[PDB]
Paper text:
The [name] NTase toxin family, MenT, modifies tRNAs to block translation. MenT toxin activity can be stringently regulated by diverse MenA antitoxins. MenT and AbiEii toxins share four highly conserved NTase motifs scattered throughout their structures, proposed to facilitate co-ordination of metals (motifs I and II), base stacking, and transfer of nucleotides to tRNA isoacceptors (motif III), and to contribute to catalysis (motif IV).
Recent characterization of the MenAT1 and MenAT3 TA systems found that MenA1 binds asymmetrically to two MenT1 toxin protomers to form a stable heterotrimeric complex in vitro, whereas MenA3 appears to function as a kinase, phosphorylating [name] at the highly conserved catalytic S786,21. Structural alignment of respective protein backbones returned an RMSD of 0.144 Å (268 atoms), and there was some small movement of the S78 loop, leading to occlusion of the active site by the phosphoserine (SEP), albeit to a lesser extent than we observed for MenT1-p. When docked to the Alphafold-predicted MenA3:[name] heterodimer used to run the simulations (pTM score 0.84), the looped region of MenA3 connecting α5-β4, spanning residues H98-I108, forces [name] S78 into an inwards-facing conformation akin to binding of MenA1 to MenT1. As a result, the overall distance between S78 and the terminal phosphate of ATP is reduced to 3.1 Å.
Residue numbers in the entry: 4 to 291
The structure:
């Protein structure tokens, strides 16, 4: 029961060590979750002049927020979508970082762009260098993409009590892309055919797509169908509905992506994962 925040970086890490052992989790994982939460709190301070989020969390960080550390893949990336524009995001986050949150501060590396076919405006990558009460704490790779169709019309707001458990009580509340659009974008990515020297390595999306299907539960799959149509049309690459092929090097990638998830009811082989996701494609495609 911590009565006050950690005094310095050394005390922070001792508490994280204690919580990680209490919860049966690897320290490095809890530590990197905390760093993503800190970054997310900076991003949640970014609003338009109505108070609406400028940045929505997506990708593996989002799944780790939705499912919890035990029930999600280890994510290294903090992926986000910018609701309004992307060049103003970098300077707004750096101000957020300098201003700080609960003792944490951040400095952000310069934004490099990326070529992605199908996206007129290009994603950006940079890095957050986090400090606690002066002493460097962790580094978080950040990617920012522009909005595509209605993938930023709405957002879910997710939380974590990880910082509470080490005596940082401030509320955590993170705006995230909704599940229909996460499914649409991961379905597109895992079935994408890459340019000759490039090769699709995204077998891990087969894990995430099973985890996201579990979370739609019995919901109408019609918002997910409309999101899939929109993404696949917006990107103007392979058509909807796609075929979930597996590539020759994917078996071990998929196995690597299953690490730590033995307790979940997931396909245990990449073939069965492809079969599971294909059935999910067909179910989404029948939802009118």
């Amino acid at each position: 029961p911590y009565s006050s925040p950690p005094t310095n970086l050394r005390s922070l890490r001792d508490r994280l060590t204690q919580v990680a052992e209490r919860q049966g989790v690897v320290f490095g994982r809890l530590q990197r979750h905390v760093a993503m939460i800190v970054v997310a709190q900076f991003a949640a301070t970014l609003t338009d002049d109505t108070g609406a989020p400028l940045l929505l969390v997506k990708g593996g960080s989002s799944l780790e927020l939705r499912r919890g550390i035990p029930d999600s893949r280890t994510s290294k990336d903090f992926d986000t979508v910018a609701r309004r524009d992307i060049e103003l995001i970098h300077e707004q986050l750096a101000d957020a970082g300098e201003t700080g949150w609960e003792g944490f501060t951040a400095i952000f590396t310069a934004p490099e762009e990326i070529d992605v076919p199908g996206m007129p405006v290009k994603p950006r990558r940079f890095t957050a260098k986090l400090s606690y009460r002066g002493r460097a704490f962790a580094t978080v790779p950040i990617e920012v993409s522009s909005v595509e169709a209605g993938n930023a019309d709405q957002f879910d707001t997710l939380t974590s009590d990880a910082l509470g458990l080490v005596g940082v009580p401030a509320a955590v509340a993170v705006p995230c892309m909704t599940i229909p659009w996460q499914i649409a974008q991961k379905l597109h990515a895992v079935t994408a055919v890459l340019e000759e020297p490039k090769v699709n390595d995204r077998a891990h999306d087969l894990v995430d797509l099973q985890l996201l299907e579990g979370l739609l539960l019995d919901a109408d799959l019609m918002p997910t169908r409309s999101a899939c149509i929109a993404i696949f049309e917006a990107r103007a690459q392979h058509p909807w509905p796609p075929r979930v092929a597996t590539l020759p090097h994917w078996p071990l990638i998929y196995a690597g992506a299953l690490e730590g998830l033995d307790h979940l009811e997931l396909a245990r082989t990449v073939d069965a994962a492809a079969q599971a996701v294909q059935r999910f494609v067909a179910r989404i495609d029948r939802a009118t």
